Design a protein around this ligand. Structure first.
Ligand code: CLA
Ligand code: CLA
Ligand code: CLA
Ligand code: CLA
Ligand code: CLA
Ligand code: CLA
Ligand code: CLA
Ligand SMILES: CC1=C(/C=C/C(C)=C/C=C/C(C)=C/C=C/C=C(C)/C=C/C=C(C)/C=C/C2=C(C)CCCC2(C)C)C(C)(C)CCC1
Ligand SMILES: CC1=C(/C=C/C(C)=C/C=C/C(C)=C/C=C/C=C(C)/C=C/C=C(C)/C=C/C2=C(C)CCCC2(C)C)C(C)(C)CCC1
Ligand SMILES: CC1=C(/C=C/C(C)=C/C=C/C(C)=C\C=C\C=C(C)\C=C\C=C(C)\C=C\C2=C(C)CCCC2(C)C)C(C)(C)CCC1
Ligand SMILES: CC1=C(C/C=C(\C)CCC[C@H](C)CCC[C@H](C)CCCC(C)C)C(=O)c2ccccc2C1=O
Ligand code: SF4
Ligand code: SF4
Ligand code: SF4
Lengths: 75, 31, 80, 61, 27, 154, 119, 119, 731
C-alpha cells in the first residue's frame, strides 16, 4: 500500500502531467511532493484527501462504479 | 496574574514528577 | 499452579496421558469403570495448562478440567 | 435400562440434554456411568457416543 | 486576576494533597 | 409537506436535469448510431420513468418519498409488496421447513443436505404454495412447534 | 540460566547412531551408547521423548531435573512404568465425587477462600 | 561459538567493566568519561538552540539533563536489583559508586567536550 | 502483601511481568483479594467513594481555577457572541515562534474552551473572576472534606458496620429527600436568589441576598397561598440577558419555550422546574420505613408483586435478597439508570438548550452532546458488564429458586434468538436501503431511490405542535383538547419554539431520519444482542457449562471442542465496546451532520445528500474535514493545528489497537524469547538483567489493551473532527 502510494503520488508530481508550448511543464498535482511527503498531514491531506476528489464526485458519471467499488470495498 | 507559575509547575509536574514518581512507584514495587 | 481436577466421567481411555506433553497426568487403577482405570494429576506443579488434555478427552463433558490457577516459573513455560 | 431403548437425558451439562438417544451398552458391573448411549447429532468433539448413569436415563414408549 | 489568591489556592490544594497521600497510605 | 409528485416543481427540474444532462451525451453521435439509438431508448426510459411516478409524494427535494401507514391511498407503495413478499418468503420458509422435516427421517440425513433429493426437493419446492392454510392446519395439529429440545444450564 | 534456573538433563541410551531432532532446532549427532542432554524446560524434554519414542525403541530414558542448588529429580518414568500404562503404585489425587453437575455456584464460594468444585 | 574468539574475548576483557580491578567510582568515571564526552554531539549540531550562540551551552544543559536521568536509572537498578553486599558492582555500594562515577565522569565528559568545542 | 499486589498472593509469586499488569487491573477488584470479607469490602468501597468524589471536586475546582485565572471570563461576559471562550493557557517550550502567533488571543495564548462552561457559569450568575476564585477555594475545601471522610471512615472505629450498609431500606429515604430533593430545592435557592436577579440586572452577590428579596413583597403575606403573585410579571420580549431592561420581576413564571434573544430556557422556568422536582422528590423521600416505622418494607414490596396469573414465575420473591447481598446487580442498575439519564441529558442539551448563548457557539454544543453520548454508551456497557459479573460471581439460583431471574435464564434462548432476529432485520434493512440508494444515486438517478417518510416521528412532532407537516393532531391542531387545555399556561410561548426552524428543537425531518434511526436501532439491538448474550450466556452455554466456575474474564478453553476464542462473559464487553463506539458513532455523526446542515442553513444539503452512503463520506467526512486537515500546511499553520495533529495522532492510536486485536499472543511470546536471547547473549548488557521476567501480554490484557487503543483512537479522532470541523466552518 505504501509502495503504490509512493508511486502514484511521486509520479503525479514529478513525472506525469501535460506540457504546453515553449517546453513548459505541468504535473497533475504540480510538483506537490517534496514539500508534502515529509509529513503525514501533508500525506493524508495532499494525497489521500485531495486525490479523492475525482473518486468521490464521480456519481452521475461513468466513473461511478468505482464510487461503488470505493464504498463497498471500505465495507 | 502570576504568569511565571506555568514556567515552574508545568516542567516540575510534566517531566520531573514522572521521573521521581517512576522512582517511588517502581521502588515501591519492591517495598 | 494450574489445578487439574479429574472428575468421575473418566472412563480411563488414556488419551489424556498420551495427549499431555508433560506427564502431569498418569493412570491409576480405579475399580469404578469398565476399564478399571482413572487418570490422576499429581505433578500439577509442572502443569502448563495448555488444555491439550481437554481436546482429547472423549467423555460426555470433560472428565478432566484444567482450572487456570497460579503462574510459577514452570507453569509459565518460559525458556530462559 | 435395556439396550436399544430411546432415552432422554436429565443432566444439564450434556450436549444432548433433553434429546432422546439410543442405548448401545448397559453394563451390570458396578460402573458409576454404565450406560453407553449414542445419538443422531454430534457434539463439538465429533463424538456422539457418551455414557450415563441410571438417574439421568429416561426411556419412552 | 490577582496573584496572592493563586498562592492561597496552591496552599489549599497542597493541604488537599496531604489528605490525598494521607488517605492513600491507609487503604 | 408531501406534495403530490406530478406537480412538484423541483421534481420537474430533476426531469429537465436528467433528460438534458443525459442529452449532453447525445450531442456526440450521428442519427443512425447504435449508441444514439440506445440514448433514444434511454430518454424513453427517463420520461416513462418519471411519468410512472405520478402518484407518489415527492416532497421539497423532488424525490419520491413513501408511506408505511397502510393508508389504503398508498397501499401500492408498501403494503401490497409487503403481503407479496411475505407470501414469497413464507413460501421459502415453508419449503425449507418441510424439506428438513423430510430429510430428518431418511437413511443418511447428513448426505441429504449436501446432495439434495431433487425428487423430494422439487416435491416440496412447489408444494409449499398454500403455506398460510398449511401452517395454520399444522399449527392446530400440534406439529408446527416443538417442546423439550436442547438448552444450556438453566 | 544455569546460575538461577532449572536445567533439565535428559539422559538415555540407544543402540545405533541415528539422527534425532533437537527441541532447540536442527539435527543432533546421537551418540550411540549413552548420552545426556541439558535442556531448558520440561515440554522440550518430553517433546523429545515423543520425538524418539514415536519413532523407535529408545526406552530407559529420563531427565534428571537439575535445579541450581545441585540435586536431581526423576521426571517422566517416575515408576519404571510408562505413564498411560497402569501400575498399581500410583495413588490418585485430583478427583471429586461427581461431574461438573454437582459443583457449587460461585455465589456460595463468594467471600470465602474455597474453590467452585470443592465438596 | 563464533563471535566468542580470543580477539573478541581480549577486546571485551579490557572494557571498563570486565577488567580485573578498579575502584567503582573510577570504574564508573571511565564510563561517564566516554558517554559524557559523547552526548554533547547530538545536541549541538541538531538541537533546538543550534542557531544562536547557545549551540554549545544547550549541549551542556541538555546532555547533563540526560545524565542525571541516566544516573537516576543507575540508582533505580541498583536499588531494585543487586541486593547483596559483595562490595563489587553486583552490590549496592559498588553500584552507587558506579553511578556516582558515571555522574561525575559524565558531567566531566560534557564540560570536556564543551571546552574542546572552543577550537 | 509481600511484593506489589500487596493484595493477592496468587500474583506476588509470579516472576513474570504479569504481576505488574494483573497487579494493576485487579487492584479495584475488591471481591477477589487475599482475605477481604464483606465488612472489609464495604468499608473500602465506601472510603474509595470519598476519594473519588474528592477527585471530582478537585477537577471542577480545576475548571474554576483556570477560568478564574487564565481564561477571559468577564471579557467573554461583555460580548458572549463575539469573543471566544478561552480555556487554560499554554506553556509549551515546543511552540517555537510560528505556533505562538496562532494562539495569541490578547496577552494569553490559551486554548479555546470548547466545553460550554462559560455558558453555564454565565447562567448561574457568575459575572466576575472573583466569584470563580471563591468558588474554586470553595471546592478545594470540599475536596478536602471528602478526602477527610474517606480517610476518616477507614480509621478503625469509624469504619461503619455492615448493618448500616444493609440499611438499603433507608438510603432511598435520604437520597431522594436529601440528595435529590433538598439540593434541587437548594438549587432554586440559588436560581431565585442569584440567577433571576443577576439575569435581571441586580447584582445580588453574597451581600444583599437577605436584604433584597427576589420578589418585592415576599413571605410575610405569602404563607397564605397567594402564589400567583410569584408568577405575576414575566420577562416578556424586550430583554437582553444580564441587564435590567425590558424585564419584569416575577420569580416562578412558567412561560415555556426559549428566550427570544439568547435562545435558551427561561431561568424562571428552571426555578419553578427544580422547585417542583424538589417537592416531588421530597415527597418521594417519605417512602420507606426506618427506626420510626412509617413506610414500606422492601420485602413486602417485592414479595407482594407475584401475579396470580402465574405466568411470571413464583414472582419477585428472591429479588430483594439478591440486591442486598449483591453489588454488581446494584451497580448494574446504577449504570443503567445513570446511562439512560446521560442519554436523556444529551438528547436535551441540544434540543432544549438551557444555557444562554449556547446554540450561538456551534462547537461547545457540538461537543457536549457527543460527550454525553459516548459517556452514555460507556455506562450502558458498564451496566451489562456488571450484569454478567452479577450472573457469574454473584448469582444464587437456590435463593432464586424459579425466580424472575431464573426465569430469565430459562428463556434466554428466546431472548438471544429474537435480539439476533431484529438486529438481522435492521441490518438487512438499513444496509439494504443505503446500498440501494447508493447504487441508484450512483447510476445517474437520485430519483429511483427508496425514501420512506418517517411518518411516526412526524406524527409525534405533530402531537407536540409542529405544524409543518399537516397532520393537525393534539397540539398541531389549535382547537383540540390539549391545545385549549394549556392555552394560557405554556403553549404559545412554546409552539413558537417548536414551529421555528432556527432552534434545534423538533427538527424538520426527511427520510434520512428514517434510515439513520433504523441504523441506530440496529446498533442498540446488536449491542444488546452481544451484552444480553454474554450476560445471559455469562454463566453457562452448551459449548462449555463450566463458565461460572472460571470467573468473569477468563481467557478461553483452548482449541478443544472446535476452538474457544473469546467464550467468556468478558467477550460481550469486549465486542459490544466496538458496537458501543460504532453505535454512538452513528448517533453523533448523524446529529453532527444534521446540525452542520442547520447551522450552515442548507437543510437541503442534508436531506438531498444523506439518504445514501456517499452522501456521508462525501458531503460530511470529505468536506468538513477540509478545515481540519488544513490545520497546518507547508505554507504555515493556524489555531486548528492542535486538532489536525491530534486527529492524525488518534489514527496512530486506533490502528495500534489492531496490533493487539488482530494479532494475538503466541507470536509475541516466541518473539520476546528472541529479544531475551539477544539481551542475555550480548556483551555490555547482560549485566543489566531484568528482575520481572519479560513475557508477552496475556490474551485478556491484549484484547483489553487493543480495545483501549481502539477507544482512545476512536474518541480522540472524533473529538478532533467535531471541534476542528465546527471550529473550522465557524469561529
Ligand atoms: C511534559 C513535560 C515536558 C517538558 C516541560 C519538556 C520541556 C522541554 N523539552 Mg521535551 N519532551 C517531552 C516532555 C516535556 N518536555 C516528552 C514527553 C517528549 C517525548 C515526545 C519530549 C521530547 C523532547 C525532544 C525531542 C526535545 C525536547 C526539548 C525540550 C526543551 C525545549 C527546548 C527549548 O526551546 O528550551 C530552551 C532550552 C533550554 C533553556 C535548555 C534546557 C536544557 C535542560 C532541559 C535544562 C537543564 C537540565 C539539567 C542539567 C538537569 C535538571 C533536571 C532535568 C530533568 C530538568 C524543554 C526543556 C528539546 C531539548 O532537548 O531541549 C534541551 C528537544 O530537542 N523534548
Ligand atoms: C430452511 C430454511 C430456513 C428457515 C425456515 C429459517 C427460518 C428462520 N430463521 Mg434461518 N437460516 C437458514 C435457513 C432457514 N431459516 C440458513 C440456511 C441460515 C444460514 C445463513 C440461517 C441463519 C439464520 C440466522 C442467523 C437467524 C435465523 C433466524 C430464523 C428465524 C427468523 C426468520 C428469519 O429472519 O430468517 C433468517 C433468514 C436468513 C438469515 C437468511 C435466509 C436463509 C436462507 C438463505 C433462506 C432459506 C432458503 C433455504 C436454503 C432453502 C432450503 C430448502 C430447499 C433447498 C428445499 C426463522 C425461524 C433468526 C432467529 O433465530 O430468529 C428467531 C436468526 O437470528 N436464521
Ligand atoms: C444546590 C445548591 C447550591 C449550589 C450548587 C450553589 C452554587 C453556587 N452559588 Mg449559591 N446559593 C444557594 C444554593 C446553592 N448555590 C442557596 C440556597 C442560596 C440562598 C442562601 C444561595 C445564595 C448564593 C449567593 C448569594 C451567591 C451564590 C453563589 C454561588 C456560586 C459560587 C459559590 C461559591 O463561591 O462558593 C456557586 C455556583 C455566588 C455567585 O453566584 O456569585 C455571583 C453568590 O454571590 N449563592
Ligand atoms: C440527607 C442525607 C444524605 C445525603 C445528602 C447523602 C449524600 C450522599 N451519599 Mg449517603 N447515606 C445517607 C444519607 C445521605 N447521603 C444515609 C442516611 C445512609 C445510610 C442508610 C447513607 C449511605 C450511603 C452509602 C452507603 C453511600 C452514600 C453515598 C453518598 C454520596 C453519593 C455520591 C454522590 O455524590 O452522588 C451525587 C449525585 C447527584 C448529585 C445526582 C446524580 C443524578 C441526578 C439525577 C443528575 C444530576 C442532576 C442534574 C441534572 C445535573 C447537575 C449537574 C450540573 C453540571 C448541571 C452522596 C454525597 C455513596 C458515596 O459516594 O459515599 C460518599 C455511598 O457509597 N451514602
Ligand atoms: C433552600 C433555599 C432557600 C433558602 C435558604 C432561602 C432563604 C431565604 N429566603 Mg427564600 N426562596 C426560595 C428558596 C430559599 N430561600 C425559593 C425557592 C423561593 C421562591 C418560592 C424563595 C422566595 C423568597 C421570597 C419571596 C423571600 C425569601 C426570603 C428569604 C430569606 C428570609 C426567609 C432567607 C434568607 C425573604 C427575603 O428577605 O428574601 C431575601 C423574601 O421576601 N425567599
Ligand atoms: C462507577 C462505575 C464502575 C465501577 C465501580 C466499576 C467497578 C469494577 N469494574 Mg467496571 N466498568 C464500568 C464502570 C464501573 N466499574 C463501566 C462503565 C464499564 C464499561 C466500560 C466497565 C467495564 C468493566 C469490565 C470489562 C470489567 C470491570 C471490572 C470491574 C471490577 C474491577 C475493576 C478493576 O480492578 O479495574 C482496575 C483498574 C484499571 C484496569 C484501570 C483502568 C484502565 C483502563 C483499562 C484503560 C484506561 C486507560 C486510559 C484510557 C489511558 C489514558 C491515555 C489517554 C491518551 C486517554 C470493579 C468492581 C472487572 C471485573 O469485575 O472482572 C473481574 C472487568 O473485567 N468493569
Ligand atoms: C463492516 C463491518 C461489519 C458489519 C457489516 C457487521 C455486521 C454484523 N455484525 Mg458485526 N462486528 C464488526 C463489524 C461488522 N459487523 C466488528 C468490527 C466487530 C467487533 C469484532 C463485530 C462484532 C459483532 C458481534 C459480536 C456480533 C455482530 C453481529 C453482526 C450482524 C448483526 C445483525 C445484522 O445486522 O445482520 C444483517 C446482516 C448484514 C448487515 C450482513 C451484510 C449483508 C451482506 C453483505 C450481504 C450478503 C452477501 C452478499 C450477497 C455478497 C456476496 C459475496 C460474494 C462473495 C458472493 C451483522 C452481520 C451479531 C450477529 O450475529 O447478529 C445476528 C453479533 O452478535 N458483530
Ligand atoms: C567510529 C569508530 C570507532 C568508534 C569511535 C569511538 C571509540 C570514539 C569514542 C570516543 C570517546 C567517547 C572519547 C572520550 C573522550 C574523553 C577523554 C579521552 C578523556 C577526557 C577526560 C575527561 C572527560 C575529564 C573530565 C573531567 C573534567 C573535565 C573536570 C573534572 C572532572 C573530570 C576529571 C571527570 C572505533 C574507534 C571503535 C573504530 C573506528 C570507527
Ligand atoms: C444485565 C443486567 C441488567 C441490565 C442492565 C441494563 C442496561 C438494563 C436495561 C435497562 C435500560 C437501559 C433501561 C431502559 C428502560 C426503558 C424505558 C424506561 C423505556 C420506556 C419509555 C417510556 C416510559 C417513555 C414513554 C413516555 C413518553 C414518551 C412520554 C409520555 C409518558 C411516558 C413516560 C410514558 C440488570 C441490572 C437490569 C439486571 C442484572 C443483569
Ligand atoms: C400493519 C402495519 C405495519 C406492521 C406492524 C405490525 C403488524 C407489527 C407487529 C408485529 C407482529 C404482529 C409480529 C408478530 C410476530 C409474532 C410471532 C409469534 C411470529 C410468528 C412467526 C412464526 C410462527 C414463524 C414461523 C414460520 C411461518 C409462519 C411460515 C413458514 C416460515 C416459518 C417457519 C419461519 C407497518 C407499521 C409495518 C406498516 C403499516 C401497517
Ligand atoms: C506488540 C504486542 C506485544 C508487545 C508489547 C510489549 C511486551 C509491551 C511493551 C510496553 C511496555 C509497557 C514497555 C515497558 C516499559 C515500561 C515503562 C515499563 C514499566 C511498565 C509497568 C510498570 C506498567 C505483546 O506482548 C502482545 C501480546 C499479546 C498479543 C499481542 C501483543 C502485541 O501486539
Ligand atoms: S478422561 Fe477422557 S481422556 Fe482422561 S482417560 Fe477417561 S477418557 Fe481417556
Ligand atoms: S493441562 Fe495442559 S499440560 Fe497439564 S495435562 Fe491438561 S493439557 Fe497436558
Ligand atoms: S487461540 Fe489460544 S485462546 Fe483463542 S482459542 Fe485457540 S487457544 Fe484458546
Amino acid at each position: 500500500s505504501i509502495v503504490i502510494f509512493h508511486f502514484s503520488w511521486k509520479m503525479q508530481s514529478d513525472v506525469w502531467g501535460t506540457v504546453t508550448s515553449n517546453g513548459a511543464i505541468s504535473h497533475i498535482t504540480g510538483g506537490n511532493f517534496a514539500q508534502s511527503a515529509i509529513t503525514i498531514n501533508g500525506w493524508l491531506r495532499d494525497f489521500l484527501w485531495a486525490q479523492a476528489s475525482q473518486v468521490i464526485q464521480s456519481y452521475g458519471s461513468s466513473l461511478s462504479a468505482y464510487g461503488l467499488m470505493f464504498l463497498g470495498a471500505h465495507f | 496574574s502570576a504568569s511565571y507559575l506555568p514556567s515552574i509547575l508545568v516542567p516540575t509536574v510534566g517531566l520531573i514528577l514522572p521521573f521521581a514518581s517512576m522512582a517511588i512507584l517502581f521502588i515501591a514495587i519492591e517495598k | 499452579a494450574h489445578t487439574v481436577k479429574i472428575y468421575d466421567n473418566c472412563i480411563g481411555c488414556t488419551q489424556c496421558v498420551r495427549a499431555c506433553p508433560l506427564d502431569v497426568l498418569e493412570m491409576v487403577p480405579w475399580d469404578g469403570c469398565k476399564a478399571g482405570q482413572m487418570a490422576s494429576a499429581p505433578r500439577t506443579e509442572d502443569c502448563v495448562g495448555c488444555k491439550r488434555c481437554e481436546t482429547a478427552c472423549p467423555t460426555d463433558f470433560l472428565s478432566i478440567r484444567v482450572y487456570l490457577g497460579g503462574e510459577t516459573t514452570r507453569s509459565m513455560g518460559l525458556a530462559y | 435400562i435395556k439396550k436399544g431403548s430411546l432415552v432422554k437425558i436429565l443432566r444439564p451439562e450434556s450436549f444432548w440434554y433433553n434429546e432422546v438417544g439410543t442405548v448401545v451398552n448397559v453394563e451390570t458391573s458396578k460402573v458409576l456411568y454404565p450406560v453407553l448411549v449414542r445419538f443422531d447429532k454430534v457434539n463439538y468433539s465429533g463424538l456422539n457416543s457418551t455414557n450415563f448413569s441410571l438417574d439421568e436415563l429416561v426411556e419412552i414408549k | 486576576i490577582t496573584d496572592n489568591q493563586v498562592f492561597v489556592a496552591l496552599i489549599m490544594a497542597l493541604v488537599c494533597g496531604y489528605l490525598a497521600v494521607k488517605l492513600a497510605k491507609q487503604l | 409537506v408531501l406534495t403530490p409528485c406530478q406537480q412538484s416543481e423541483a421534481f420537474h427540474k430533476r426531469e429537465i436535469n436528467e433528460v438534458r444532462t443525459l442529452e449532453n451525451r447525445q450531442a456526440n453521435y450521428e442519427a443512425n448510431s447504435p449508441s444514439y439509438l440506445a440514448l433514444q431508448s434511454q430518454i424513453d426510459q427517463v420520461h416513462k420513468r418519471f411519468d410512472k411516478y405520478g402518484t407518489l409524494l415527492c416532497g421539497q427535494d423532488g424525490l419520491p418519498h413513501l408511506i408505511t401507514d397502510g393508508d389504503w391511498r398508498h397501499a401500492r407503495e408498501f403494503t401490497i409488496p409487503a403481503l407479496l413478499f411475505l407470501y414469497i418468503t413464507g413460501w421459502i420458509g415453508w419449503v425449507g421447513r418441510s424439506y428438513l422435516k423430510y430429510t430428518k427421517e431418511t437413511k443418511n440425513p447428513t448426505e441429504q443436505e449436501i446432495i439434495l433429493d431433487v425428487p423430494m426437493a422439487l416435491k416440496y419446492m412447489l408444494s409449499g404454495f398454500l403455506w398460510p392454510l398449511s401452517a395454520w392446519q399444522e399449527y392446530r395439529s400440534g406439529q408446527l412447534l416443538a417442546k423439550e429440545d436442547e438448552i444450556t444450564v438453566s | 540460566c544455569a546460575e538461577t534456573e532449572e536445567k533439565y538433563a535428559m539422559t538415555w541410551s540407544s543402540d545405533q547412531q541415528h539422527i534425532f531432532e533437537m527441541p532447540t532446532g536442527g539435527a543432533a549427532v546421537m551418540n550411540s551408547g549413552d548420552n545426556l542432554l541439558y535442556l531448558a524446560r520440561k515440554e522440550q524434554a518430553l517433546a523429545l521423548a515423543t520425538q524418539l519414542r514415536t519413532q523407535f525403541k529408545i526406552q530407559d530414558y529420563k531427565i534428571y531435573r537439575i535445579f541450581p542448588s545441585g540435586e536431581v529429580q526423576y521426571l517422566h518414568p517416575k515408576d519404571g512404568v510408562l505413564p498411560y500404562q497402569v501400575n498399581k503404585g500410583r495413588e490418585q489425587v485430583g478427583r471429586v465425587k461427581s461431574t461438573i453437575g454437582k459443583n457449587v455456584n460461585p455465589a456460595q464460594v463468594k467471600f470465602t477462600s474455597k474453590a467452585t468444585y470443592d465438596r | 561459538p563464533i563471535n566468542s574468539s580470543s580477539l573478541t574475548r581480549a577486546y571485551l576483557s579490557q572494557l571498563p567493566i570486565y577488567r580485573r580491578g578498579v575502584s567503582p567510582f573510577l570504574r564508573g568515571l571511565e564510563i561517564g568519561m566516554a558517554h559524557g564526552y559523547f552526548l554533547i554531539g547530538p545536541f549541538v549540531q541538531l538541537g533546538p538552540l543550534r542557531n544562536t550562540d547557545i549551540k554549545y551551552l544547550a549541549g551542556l544543559l541538555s546532555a547533563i539533563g540526560l545524565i542525571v536521568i541516566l544516573t537516576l536509572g543507575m540508582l533505580l537498578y541498583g536499588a531494585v536489583s543487586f541486593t547483596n553486599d559483595s562490595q563489587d558492582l553486583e552490590s549496592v555500594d559498588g553500584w552507587r559508586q558506579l553511578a556516582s562515577g558515571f555522574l561525575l565522569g559524565a558531567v566531566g565528559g560534557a564540560g570536556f567536550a564543551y571546552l574542546l568545542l572552543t577550537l | 502483601a509481600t511484593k506489589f499486589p500487596k493484595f493477592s498472593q496468587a500474583l506476588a509469586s509470579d516472576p513474570t511481568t504479569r504481576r505488574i499488569w494483573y497487579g494493576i487491573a485487579t487492584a479495584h477488584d475488591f471481591e477477589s483479594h487475599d482475605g477481604m470479607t464483606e465488612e472489609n469490602l464495604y468499608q473500602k468501597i465506601f472510603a474509595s467513594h470519598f476519594g473519588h468524589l474528592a477527585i471530582i471536586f478537585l477537577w471542577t475546582s480545576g475548571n474554576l481555577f483556570h477560568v478564574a485565572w487564565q481564561g477571559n471570563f468577564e471579557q467573554w461576559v461583555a460580548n458572549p457572541l463575539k469573543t471566544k471562550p478561552l480555556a487554560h493557557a499554554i506553556w509549551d517550550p515546543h511552540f517555537g515562534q510560528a505556533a505562538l502567533k496562532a494562539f495569541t488571543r490578547g496577552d494569553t495564548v490559551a486554548n479555546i474552551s470548547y466545553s460550554g462552561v462559560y455558558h453555564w457559569w454565565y447562567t448561574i450568575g457568575i459575572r466576575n473572576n472573583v466569584e470563580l476564585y471563591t468558588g474554586a477555594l470553595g471546592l478545594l475545601v470540599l475536596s478536602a472534606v471528602f478526602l477527610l471522610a474517606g480517610w476518616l471512615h477507614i480509621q478503625p472505629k469509624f469504619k461503619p458496620s455492615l448493618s448500616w450498609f444493609k440499611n438499603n431500606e433507608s438510603r432511598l429515604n435520604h437520597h431522594l429527600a436529601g440528595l435529590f430533593g433538598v439540593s434541587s430545592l437548594a438549587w432554586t435557592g440559588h436560581l431565585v436568589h442569584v440567577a433571576i436577579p443577576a439575569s435581571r440586572g441586580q447584582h445580588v452577590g453574597w451581600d444583599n441576598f437577605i436584604m433584597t428579596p427576589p420578589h418585592p413583597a415576599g413571605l410575610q403575606p405569602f404563607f397564605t397561598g397567594n402564589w400567583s403573585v410569584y408568577a405575576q410579571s414575566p420577562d416578556s420580549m424586550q430583554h437582553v440577558f444580564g441587564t435590567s431592561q425590558g424585564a419584569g420581576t416575577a420569580i416562578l413564571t412558567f412561560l415555556g419555550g426559549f428566550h427570544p434573544q439568547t435562545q435558551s430556557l427561561w431561568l424562571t422556568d428552571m426555578a419553578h422546574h427544580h422547585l417542583a422536582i424538589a417537592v416531588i422528590f421530597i415527597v418521594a423521600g417519605h417512602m420507606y420505613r426506618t427506626n420510626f416505622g412509617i413506610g414500606h418494607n422492601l420485602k413486602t414490596i417485592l414479595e407482594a408483586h407475584r401475579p396470580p396469573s402465574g405466568r411470571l414465575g413464583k414472582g419477585h420473591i428472591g429479588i430483594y435478597q439478591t440486591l442486598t447481598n449483591s453489588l454488581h446487580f446494584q451497580l448494574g442498575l446504577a449504570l443503567a439508570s445513570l446511562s439512560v439519564v446521560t442519554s436523556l441529558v444529551a438528547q436535551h442539551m441540544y434540543a432544549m438548550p438551557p444555557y444562554a448563548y449556547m446554540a450561538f457557539d456551534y462547537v461547545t454544543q457540538s461537543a457536549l452532546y457527543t460527550h454525553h453520548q459516548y459517556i452514555a454508551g460507556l455506562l450502558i456497557v458498564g451496566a451489562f458488564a456488571h450484569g454478567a459479573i452479577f450472573f457469574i460471581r454473584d448469582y444464587d439460583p437456590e435463593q432464586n429458586q424459579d425466580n424472575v431471574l431464573a426465569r430469565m435464564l430459562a428463556h434466554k434462548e428466546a431472548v438471544i434468538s429474537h435480539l439476533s432476529w431484529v438486529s438481522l432485520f435492521l441490518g438487512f434493512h438499513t444496509l439494504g436501503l443505503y446500498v440501494h440508494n447508493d447504487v441508484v444515486v450512483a447510476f445517474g438517478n437520485p430519483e429511483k431511490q427508496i425514501l420512506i417518510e418517517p411518518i411516526f416521528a412526524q406524527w409525534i412532532q405533530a402531537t407536540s405542535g409542529k405544524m409543518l407537516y399537516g397532520f393537525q393532531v393534539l397540539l398541531s391542531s389549535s382547537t383540540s383538547n390539549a391545545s385549549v387545555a394549556a392555552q394560557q399556561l405554556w403553549l404559545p410561548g412554546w409552539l413558537e419554539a417548536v414551529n421555528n426552524e432556527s432552534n434545534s428543537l423538533f427538527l424538520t425531518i426527511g427520510p434520512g431520519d428514517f434510515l439513520v434511526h433504523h441504523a441506530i436501532a440496529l446498533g442498540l439491538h446488536t449491542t444488546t444482542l452481544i451484552l444480553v448474550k454474554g450476560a445471559l450466556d455469562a454463566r453457562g452455554s452448551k459449548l462449555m457449562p463450566d463458565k461460572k466456575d472460571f470467573g468473569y474474564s477468563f481467557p478461553c478453553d483452548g482449541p478443544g471442542r472446535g476452538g474457544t476464542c473469546d467464550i467468556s462473559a468478558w467477550d460481550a464487553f469486549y465486542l459490544a465496546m466496538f458496537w458501543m463506539l460504532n453505535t454512538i458513532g452513528w448517533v453523533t455523526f448523524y446529529w453532527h451532520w444534521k446540525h452542520l446542515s442547520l447551522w450552515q442553513g442548507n437543510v437541503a444539503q442534508f436531506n438531498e445528500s444523506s439518504t445514501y452512503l456517499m452522501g456521508w463520506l462525501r458531503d460530511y467526512l470529505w468536506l468538513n474535514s477540509s478545515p481540519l486537515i488544513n490545520g497546518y500546511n507547508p505554507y504555515g499553520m493556524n489555531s486548528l493545528a492542535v486538532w489536525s495533529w491530534m486527529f492524525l495522532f488518534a489514527h496512530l492510536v486506533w490502528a495500534t489497537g489492531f496490533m493487539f486485536l488482530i494479532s494475538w499472543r503466541g507470536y509475541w511470546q516466541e518473539l520476546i524469547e528472541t529479544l531475551a536471547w539477544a539481551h542475555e547473549r550480548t556483551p555490555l548488557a547482560n549485566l543489566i538483567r531484568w528482575k520481572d521476567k519479560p513475557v508477552a501480554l496475556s490474551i485478556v490484557q491484549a484484547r483489553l489493551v487493543g480495545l483501549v487503543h481502539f477507544t482512545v483512537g476512536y474518541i480522540l479522532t472524533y473529538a478532533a473532527f467535531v471541534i476542528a470541523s465546527t471550529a473550522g466552518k465557524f469561529s
